[PDB]
Design a protein around this ligand. Structure first.
Ligand code: HEA
Ligand code: HEA
Ligand SMILES: CCCCCCCCCCCCCCCC(=O)OC[C@H](COP(=O)([O-])OCC[N+](C)(C)C)OC(=O)CCCCCCCCCCCCCCC
Ligand SMILES: CCCCCCCCCCCCCCCC(=O)OC[C@H](COP(=O)(O)OCCN)OC(=O)CCCCCCCCCCCCCCC
Ligand SMILES: CCCCCCCCCCCCCCCC(=O)OC[C@H](COP(=O)(O)OCCN)OC(=O)CCCCCCCCCCCCCCC
Ligand SMILES: CCCCCCCCCCCCCCCC(=O)OC[C@H](COP(=O)(O)OCCN)OC(=O)CCCCCCCCCCCCCCC
Ligand SMILES: CCCCCCCCCCCCCCCC(=O)OC[C@H](COP(=O)(O)OCCN)OC(=O)CCCCCCCCCCCCCCC
Ligand SMILES: CCCCCCCCCCCCCCCC(=O)OC[C@H](COP(=O)(O)OCCN)OC(=O)CCCCCCCCCCCCCCC
Ligand SMILES: CCCCCCCCCCCCCCCC(=O)OC[C@H](COP(=O)(O)OCCN)OC(=O)CCCCCCCCCCCCCCC
Ligand SMILES: CCCCCCCCCCCCCCCC(=O)OC[C@H](COP(=O)(O)OCCN)OC(=O)CCCCCCCCCCCCCCC
Ligand SMILES: CCCCCCCCCCCCCCCC(=O)OC[C@H](COP(=O)(O)OCCN)OC(=O)CCCCCCCCCCCCCCC
Ligand SMILES: CCCCCCCCCCCCCCCC(=O)OC[C@H](COP(=O)(O)OCCN)OC(=O)CCCCCCCCCCCCCCC
Ligand code: CUA
Ligand SMILES: [Ca+2]
Ligand SMILES: [Cu+2]
Ligand SMILES: [Mg+2]
Lengths: 67, 59, 55, 45, 102, 534, 51, 269, 236
């Protein structure tokens, strides 16, 4: 009644934002060093190998997902 | 020796709890609480050595 | 007169069930003939070009 | 008798917008990972 | 129920005639509009006279609100309003749209 | 104060002790799942410094706590012991000291499970504690013994409560209530108690066999000695599929109550719902080897088991079509139990359709021990049984507590858990169909993309759990004021369209069960004279 | 035994008339439950030399 | 009777049990038993005194619970007809649960025997294992069980028929025959070639018949308490339900011993 | 052949078993999407046209002429999805005239492969253990938690029979793009077949909880042509 749909829309978006922010703040407490394979150069050098071995022909083989 | 009416007249006309209403209940109930009180807390004393990893002396 | 107006939930559930089967049918037919029969064709043109790369 | 507007008109003008609303709600309820993949770096954009 | 429409009207005419207070006329009106048919004009007329006997005016307005919600068109509603007009003006009940105009 | 709660003998007190333990252990299992899902967020060691044994121990604790210490003592232990005597008109359960020991053996299972975690390394074996990993060669120490004793004490509780339930609804029904005129929740607890009584023996036999194998040098599942671990798989899963139908059948009863009272029309074909529940319970004993499709059975074995696993889609389909038919043509009052029931009716069917994908042993070679299976069962568990559990709480809490909850906060909590659970468990099908295996603390780097979004959704789910904790606090403190102001729904049924606001006031509650006619918080002696029914 | 009826007498814990705030008991009941796996994690990481 | 005096009773036939400490006492005894055996199995406790104390506390707490049940049924008159029907139904569900435990054990035997391993030699009973022959002592053990049922049947029907000496003597004969069976099983277990560690054969054999042995020693205990309560006039001619449960228990232990006999001693040799 | 980031479908098939598994999965998913569209459309339209309905049709309880229909119609759709499933089930079990056997024994956190046919000029059985390359010794470009130090090499267009067992606990020899999943239990020997249709390299992993090294236990299969297989086998 009279603007409680708006309240339980704002509360849902606020809960999503608080969850994203606290997820970020406890991702800041993880291991400081990601594995060596999670950069762009390693993944291009793995797609090198996969192209040489004809991997995943009709789908895709490319492994690059990081920067 | 057919004491059942005489015991009905005690168990129904009583104020005490049901496990206390017999005359011989102080002979069962007072040792049992001591035996129970050591039986439930002595493994709880060995819980920290089991966490630390200290085995008992056997040799 | 006013002729009897009866049975609107009958024809309503009949059109609702028919519409539900038709919407599920167009979703599933898109699934098959647009995703599955693209994956199949990308697979089989690879196998048919392999069977000529082997002469 | 069949007084009034036809039932195909009466229920088409009710069922037509709810088809589109169902399509929108179903595609946001199922295709929400497409919105993450579109902004992920694996798309190379 | 394997009921025909005519058995429905003859059941609910004599069901409205035997209601004796406001609980009963509202109850009978509820469980006659809770079917998959708009009631015939005769049983709506019997419902109006029954709400007259119990002397409650908003139930005789809610009758017309209920059949507005119950018919398929607005021309079926206007057909009810045509030949239910005489009993409505005789009892003197207003329709809700002309009572609370938006 | 010690005689009402320690020496307890009324079912309505043992039910709230069950509920307190259930929500405590659910906080424990949700914390364990948060640690699991936080470690799984990215490749490499993140929070547990390597140490995959600790990951496996946490997975064991998460599964055992959430199944045997949240869903069973919540649904069966709380709701059955509270509501089945009140809905059959019984003054109490038959055998009430049994009903008290069936609660008080659960904190003891909890403390032995927690010290199973604290001794040498914990039992990291899965919740299906398979030998030879669960043996004495691969798991040295008292960890697995204490986990087996936790399962023993929980099986003692759920067997004694099952005997209690069967006898108290075959014997203590009030004086108009034939078996055909039972509520659907009573039929749920009834059929669940038979499944418990028929299935918990074989589990107790199998894990006592395992315990004797570990400690008494006997060889039931030791290969160098004549054993076979496939015998453990058979003896476990003959309990294990009846266990998961035990988890869901009271959920079916709760949903059939909620959907009917918020559609304001009765359930479409009630006796066919009873027949469907009984058929699910009967057929659940014939399907146990669909968890054993890979172990090396024959082809005709697997053909029968696909057939029998497939033909349980018929009574569940009858139930779900009946739920859609009993909301069709209704007057839906969108309250929080109704929101949870509609979310059940969608997400449970999605989990069941992935279940019939898994039912084909031809296809289950592509999906066994993958995260696809994890997606199926976490759908039908944390969106079937947890959603029906939340529906039962929001449906019965103000009646049986006397205190209303904040309605807007409840709907915020619902939408947050409905978003968050979807975000956890929907990408698991993508991971499982691409080949990601189960029970791994670390994965290849190609699985990072959906694992990250799943652990983002994990925080939404636990945020809604924290909101639920605050909803409990606001209900316990301000629950008498929520009736006065407009922060809560006081009547779960509105007046009918021609029912006056004053004619509604003499008949405020219109229910088909006794639970909503009682005094709020119900009396210590409900039914002094027996209730009567035509 | 005849027990008390009413609104707050069905729960084993005290809510209204307390010398301490109720939120203490309420949130410390659940923070212990949320904190059992962290005690588990701490002792099984101190046993494995990671701390 | 008048309304004023009918209002001083219960209006419904069901036992509203008084609050009792033995549920939480037996629960803590099961805790102490679990925590004691899981630490003496792995050497964190020196001797078996903790396990002995825990089993003793468990047994005495169960005895005090049964004493209170006897007190309610005899000295307070709380067991009406509906309560009797409920107790009989609960005991029937209990014996169905135990028959299902034995069905799991028979499944274990059959899964080891229907097609055995290669490490025993595609053989049943395995090579080197000297199996117990079904003719000597287990035949006497079937005879003294089929006869124990025949004794307890006339003891029951003479309890109904008004006889006192013909029921007490039949109960005494039943109890002594049960302890004859238990001592004969002890003699077989001592003079058996294989042990419980001698492979899967000794495992399944001693599991099945040792669970039956434990059920028979509890059967001897409840036959003894039925003799005590019949001599001390607790049991009556129309209201003897613990006796009836013991009769049901004898007649299901008889048929599961027969299944153990024909499976473990005839088909499996 | 290898998982890709953000993927949502199967890996690309390499055997007829996996390419049949994909078709059966899509055929099941067809009717599954029909049923999902039906129940989601009903669940949408009911709560969007009866949430604003003030009169509930409270006398609809039986529906006899349509309860039989929604009992019968799930059964015939079960029959339709069960017709190809039985054909695939009874096609994938026959291991008829294979040209190669390979044993795969799962130890705790390595696999041990054993070509046992003595088609060599050496005439002796070929075995080797394949361990995961640890993360600190990965040379650059290698796939983490997938690459091994030694490999299992198999010729193409050859019926191969994998005989799978274990040594201490239960493992699982699983390669998804080949579509083989087979439990290695320490008592028995299972078998699967494959026919590799294209050369390449296909990865898999232990899909059964082995313990604390369960994630560190991969499978790597190089399928080559038969000359290159022979020249590989001539060494090891
Ligand atoms: C009861 C069933 C149940 C529930 C609810 C959950 C809930 C969750 N589970 Fe899990 N899970 C299992 C049963 C369950 N799980 C089982 C059986 C396994 C197998 C273990 C094995 O492989 O051996 C498993 C394993 C498992 C895996 C696979 C990991 C692996 O294979 O090793 C993952 C993946 O991240 C996971 C995560 C989660 C997450 C993030 C939640 C989140 O959904 C948590 C969010 C849920 C809530 C917030 C619920 C509300 C909380 C309450 C306390 C309800 C209170 C309400 C009242 C009391 C009225 N759990
Ligand atoms: C809440 C408990 C629960 C419920 C209700 C179910 C329901 C079902 N489950 Fe599930 N399952 C689990 C809990 C549950 N499951 C757990 C815990 C595991 C993993 C254990 C472990 O490994 O640790 C598991 C894993 C599991 C496996 C093992 C796979 C593997 O481990 O490799 C299989 C195999 O067949 C299976 C199938 C099914 C089927 C066919 C149903 C059916 O009952 C579903 C029926 C419902 C529907 C079918 C949808 C509604 C119907 C219609 C809309 C009608 C029209 C539809 C059709 C005609 C198809 N599930
Ligand atoms: C309010 C609190 C203030 C903001 C807190 C967040 C601060 C922040 O910048 O977070 C960074 C994270 C990156 O998190 P990460 O990629 O896991 O790296 C964390 C650091 N390591 C582990 C390498 C040591 O970035 C992220 O968390 C990205 C996830 C964000 C989730 C929502 C994305 C969509 C929003 C709409
Ligand atoms: C990201 C944000 C996601 C949304 C979060 C905010 C939502 C707030 C909505 C709100 O608050 O709406 C409040 C409205 C009621 O409005 P009223 O007509 O009573 O208004 C009166 C004047 N104010 O209930 C609704 O939504 C109607 C729909 C509710 C249906 C809920 C079902 C639960 C989900 C089931 C899954 C769907 C299955 C079917 C899919 C095919
Ligand atoms: C952990 C739980 C996460 C929180 C989710 C539930 C809380 C809902 C609060 C809400 O929904 O706040 C929405 C309301 C909508 O304002 P209103 O129109 O009700 O204003 C009437 C006066 N209250 O903002 C507020 O009132 C207060 C402002 C809240 C924002 C605080 C954080 C700022 C960013
Ligand atoms: C049901 C429909 C589910 C919605 C899928 C959204 C895709 C998001 C996305 O965008 O996925 C991105 C992926 C990866 O992209 P790529 O590797 O092709 O990139 C190369 C070019 N950029 O796309 C795909 O491969 C598949 C896309 C279509 C998926 C349809 C099949 C879905 C599997 C069905 C089984 C899983 C459901 C189990 C039952 C619930
Ligand atoms: C429904 C609500 C769903 C909320 C959870 C979404 C998680 C988003 C995420 O997880 O974001 C991950 C992606 C890709 O990140 P990356 O792989 O490039 O980087 C990996 C290291 N961080 O970033 C985004 O797409 C940002 C845009 C989010 C858009 C969400 C749209 C939802 C509709
Ligand atoms: C497994 C444990 C044994 C269960 C026996 C159930 C019998 C059914 C029955 O008839 O139970 C009747 C009595 C309980 O009666 P009550 O006091 O609840 O009833 C009040 C009416 N007089 O059984 C018992 O004393 C069970 C004692 C179990 C002791 C713990 C053993 C744990 C192992
Ligand atoms: C930081 C965390 C999020 C803060 C939310 C701010 C709300 C803004 C506000 O102040 O909102 C004002 C409203 C007014 O309330 P109303 O609905 O009565 O009025 C409605 C007016 N139309 O309060 C709320 O509805 C939200 C109150 C809920 C807050 C959640 C509390 C934290 C929950 C998690 C911690 C507890 C569990 C942890 C233990 C394990
Ligand atoms: C609880 C519900 C689940 C029950 C599951 C099955 C329970 C099995 C009962 C075990 C009895 C075995 C037995 O009595 O075996 C007798 C054996 C000793 O005999 P032996 O081999 O030395 O004699 C042969 C010498 N010639 O004792 C044991 O070494 C184990 C004792 C502990 C058993 C517990
Ligand atoms: C462990 C040792 C087990 C020995 C059990 C002896 C039971 C004595 C109590 C008794 O016999 O209770 C007597 C009552 C009824 O008494 P009545 O009506 O015959 O009295 C007549 C007065 N005129 O029977 C019962 O409630 C049922 C007893 C079932 C007990 C099953 C226990 C199983 C435990 C498994 C673990
Ligand atoms: C292929 C099947 C797929 C089923 C999918 C499940 C859909 C569930 C949601 C819709 C359920 C509809 C409500 C229940 C039906 C009902 O209301 O039954 C009550 C009435 C019966 O009453 P009567 O004697 O007055 O009518 C006399 C007429 N027999 O029958 C109806 O009005 C609908 C009749 C439907 C006829 C078959 C249509 C099949 C297409
Ligand atoms: Cu080998 Cu897991
Ligand atoms: Ca990780
Ligand atoms: Cu199952
Ligand atoms: Mg497996």
């Amino acid at each position: 009644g009279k603007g409680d749909v708006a309240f339980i829309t704002k509360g849902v978006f606020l809960g999503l934002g608080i969850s994203f922010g606290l997820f970020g703040l406890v991702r800041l407490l993880a291991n400081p060093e990601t594995p060596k394979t999670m950069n762009r150069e390693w993944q291009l050098k793995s797609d090198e190998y996969l192209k040489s071995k004809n991997a995943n022909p009709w789908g895709g083989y490319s492994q690059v997902q990081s920067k | 020796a057919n004491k059942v009416i005489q015991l009905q007249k005690i168990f129904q006309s009583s104020t005490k709890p049901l496990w206390w209403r017999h005359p011989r209940s102080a002979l069962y109930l007072y040792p049992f609480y001591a035996i129970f009180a050591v039986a439930v807390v002595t493994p709880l004393l060995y819980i920290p050595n089991a966490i630390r990893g200290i085995k008992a002396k056997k040799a | 007169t006013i002729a009897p107006i009866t049975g609107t939930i009958k024809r309503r559930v009949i059109m609702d069930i028919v519409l539900g089967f038709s919407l599920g049918g167009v979703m599933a037919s898109y699934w098959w003939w647009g995703f599955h029969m693209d994956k199949i064709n990308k697979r089989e043109k690879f196998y048919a070009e392999l069977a000529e790369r082997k002469k | 008798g069949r007084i009034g507007e036809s039932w195909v008109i009466t229920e088409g003008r009710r069922l037509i917008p709810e088809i589109f609303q169902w399509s929108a709600v179903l595609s946001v309820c199922l295709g929400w990972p497409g919105a993450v993949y579109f902004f992920s770096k694996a798309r190379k954009a | 129920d394997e009921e025909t429409f005519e058995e429905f009207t003859a059941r609910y005419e004599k069901e409205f005639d035997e209601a004796y207070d406001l609980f009963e006329v509202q109850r009978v009106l509820n469980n006659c509009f809770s079917y998959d048919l708009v009631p015939a004009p005769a049983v709506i007329e019997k419902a109006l006279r029954a709400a007259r006997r119990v002397n409650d005016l908003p139930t005789a307005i809610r009758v017309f609100e209920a059949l507005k919600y119950k018919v398929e068109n607005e021309d079926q509603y206007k057909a009810y309003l045509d030949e239910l007009k005489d009993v409505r003006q005789e009892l003197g009940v207003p329709l809700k749209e002309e009572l609370f105009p938006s | 104060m010690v005689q009402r709660w320690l020496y307890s003998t009324n079912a309505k007190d043992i039910a709230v002790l069950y509920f307190m333990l259930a929500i405590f252990s659910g906080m424990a299992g949700t914390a364990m799942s948060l640690i699991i899902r936080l470690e799984l967020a990215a490749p490499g060691s993140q929070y547990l410094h390597g140490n995959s044994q600790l990951f496996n121990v946490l997975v064991v604790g998460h599964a055992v706590l959430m199944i045997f210490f949240l869903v069973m003592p919540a649904l069966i232990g709380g709701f059955g012991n509270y509501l089945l005597p009140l809905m059959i008109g019984a003054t109490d359960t038959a055998f009430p000291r049994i009903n008290n020991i069936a609660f008080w053996v659960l904190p003891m299972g909890l403390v032995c499970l927690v010290t199973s975690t604290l001794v040498e390394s914990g039992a990291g074996t899965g919740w299906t504690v398979y030998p030879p990993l669960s043996s004495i060669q691969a798991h040295s120490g008292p960890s697995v013994d204490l986990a087996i004793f936790a399962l023993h004490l929980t099986s003692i509780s759920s067997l004694l409560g099952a005997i209690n339930f069967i006898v108290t609804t075959l014997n203590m029904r009030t004086n108009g209530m034939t078996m055909h005129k039972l509520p659907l929740f009573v039929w749920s607890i009834f059929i669940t108690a038979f499944l418990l009584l028929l299935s918990l023996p074989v589990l107790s036999a199998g894990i006592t066999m395992l315990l004797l194998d570990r400690n008494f040098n006997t060889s039931f599942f030791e290969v160098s000695g004549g054993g076979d671990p496939i015998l453990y798989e058979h003896l476990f899963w003959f309990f294990g599929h009846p266990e998961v139908y035990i988890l869901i059948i009271p959920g079916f009863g709760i949903i059939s109550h909620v959907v009917s009272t918020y559609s304001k029309k009765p359930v479409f074909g009630e006796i066919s719902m009873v027949y469907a529940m009984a058929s699910i319970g009967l057929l659940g004993f014939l399907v146990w080897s669909h968890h054993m499709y890979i172990v090396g059975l024959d082809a005709d074995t697997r053909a029968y088991f696909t057939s029998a696993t497939m033909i349980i889609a018929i009574p569940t389909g009858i139930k779900i079509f009946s739920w859609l038919a009993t909301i069709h043509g209704g007057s839906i009052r969108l309250a929080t139990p109704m929101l949870y029931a509609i979310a059940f009716l969608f997400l449970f069917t999605m989990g069941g359709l992935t279940g019939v994908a898994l039912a084909n042993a031809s296809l289950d070679v592509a999906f066994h021990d993958t995260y696809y299976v994890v997606g199926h069962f976490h759908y039908v568990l944390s969106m079937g049984a947890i959603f029906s559990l939340f529906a039962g709480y929001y449906y019965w809490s103000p009646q049986i507590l006397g205190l209303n909850y904040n309605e807007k906060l409840a709907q915020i909590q619902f939408w947050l858990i409905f978003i968050g659970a979807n975000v956890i468990f929907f990408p698991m099908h993508f991971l499982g169909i691409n080949g990601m295996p189960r029970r791994i603390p670390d994965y290849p780097d190609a699985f990072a993309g959906w694992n990250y979004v799943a652990s983002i959704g994990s925080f939404i789910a636990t945020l809604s759990l924290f909101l639920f904790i605050y909803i409990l606090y606001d209900q316990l403190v301000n629950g008498l004021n929520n009736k006065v102001n407009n922060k809560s729904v006081i009547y779960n049924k509105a007046p009918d369209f021609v029912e006056s606001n004053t004619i509604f006031n003499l008949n405020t509650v219109k229910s088909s069960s006794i639970e909503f006619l009682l005094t709020s918080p119900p009396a210590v002696h409900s039914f002094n004279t027996p209730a009567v029914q035509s | 035994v005849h027990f008390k009826d009413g609104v707050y007498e069905n729960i084993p814990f005290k809510v209204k008339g307390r010398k301490t705030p109720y939120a203490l008991s309420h949130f410390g009941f659940f923070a212990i439950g949320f904190a059992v796996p962290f005690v588990a994690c701490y002792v099984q990481l101190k046993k494995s030399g990671a701390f | 009777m008048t309304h004023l005096e009918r209002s001083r009773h219960q209006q419904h036939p069901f036992h509203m049990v008084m609050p009792s400490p033995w549920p939480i006492v037996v629960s803590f005894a099961l805790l102490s038993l679990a925590l004691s055996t899981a630490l003496t199995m792995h050497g964190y406790i020196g001797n078996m005194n903790m396990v002995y104390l825990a089993l003793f506390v468990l047994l005495t707490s169960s005895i005090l619970w049964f004493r209170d049940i006897v007190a309610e049924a005899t000295y307070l008159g709380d067991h009406t007809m509906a309560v009797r029907k409920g107790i009989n139904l609960g005991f029937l569900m209990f014996v169905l649960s135990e028959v299902l435990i034995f069905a799991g054990l028979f499944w274990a035997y059959f899964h080891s025997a229907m097609s055995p391993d290669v490490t025993l030699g595609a053989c049943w009973p395995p090579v080197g294992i000297e199996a117990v022959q079904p003719t000597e002592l287990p035949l006497l053990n079937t005879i003294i069980l089929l006869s124990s049922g025949a004794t307890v049947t006339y003891s029951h029907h003479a309890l109904i028929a008004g006889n006192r000496n013909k029921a007490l003597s039949g109960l005494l004969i039943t109890f002594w025959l049960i302890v004859i069976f238990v001592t004969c099983q002890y003699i077989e277990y001592t003079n058996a070639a294989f042990t419980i560690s001698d492979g899967v054969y000794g495992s399944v054999f001693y599991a099945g018949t040792g669970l039956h042995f434990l059920h028979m020693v509890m059967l001897a205990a409840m036959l003894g308490v039925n003799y005590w309560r019949m001599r001390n006039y607790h049991l009556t001619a129309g209201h003897h339900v613990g006796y009836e449960t013991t009769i049901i228990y004898t007649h299901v232990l008889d048929v599961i011993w027969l299944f153990l006999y024909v499976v473990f001693y005839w088909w499996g040799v | 052949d290898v998982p890709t980031p953000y993927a949502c479908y199967f890996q690309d098939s390499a055997t007829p078993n996996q390419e049949g598994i994909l078709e059966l999965h899509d055929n099941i998913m067809f009717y599954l999407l029909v049923i999902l569209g039906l129940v989601s459309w009903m669940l949408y339209t009911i709560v969007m046209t009866y949430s604003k309905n003030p009169i509930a049709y409270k006398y609809i309880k039986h529906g006899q002429t349509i309860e039989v229909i929604w009992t019968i119609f799930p059964a015939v759709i079960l029959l339709i999805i069960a017709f190809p499933s039985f054909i695939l089930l009874y096609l994938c079990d026959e291991v008829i005239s294979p040209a190669m056997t390979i044993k795969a024994i799962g130890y705790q956190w390595y696999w041990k492969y054993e070509y046992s046919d003595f088609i060599n000029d050496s005439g002796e059985t070929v075995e080797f253990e394949s361990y995961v390359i640890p993360d600190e010794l990965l040379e650059e470009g290698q796939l983490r938690l997938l690459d091994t130090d030694t490999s299992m090499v198999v010729p193409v267009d050859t019926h191969i029979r994998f005989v799978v067992t274990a040594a201490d606990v239960i493992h699982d020899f699983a390669i998804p793009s080949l579509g083989i999943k087979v439990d290695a239990t320490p008592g028995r020997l299972n078998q699967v077949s494959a026919l590799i249709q294209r050369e390449g390299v296909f990865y898999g992993a232990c899909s059964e909880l082995c313990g604390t090294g369960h994630a560190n236990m991969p499978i790597k299969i190089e399928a080559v042509s038969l000359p290159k297989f022979l020249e590989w086998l001539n060494e090891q």
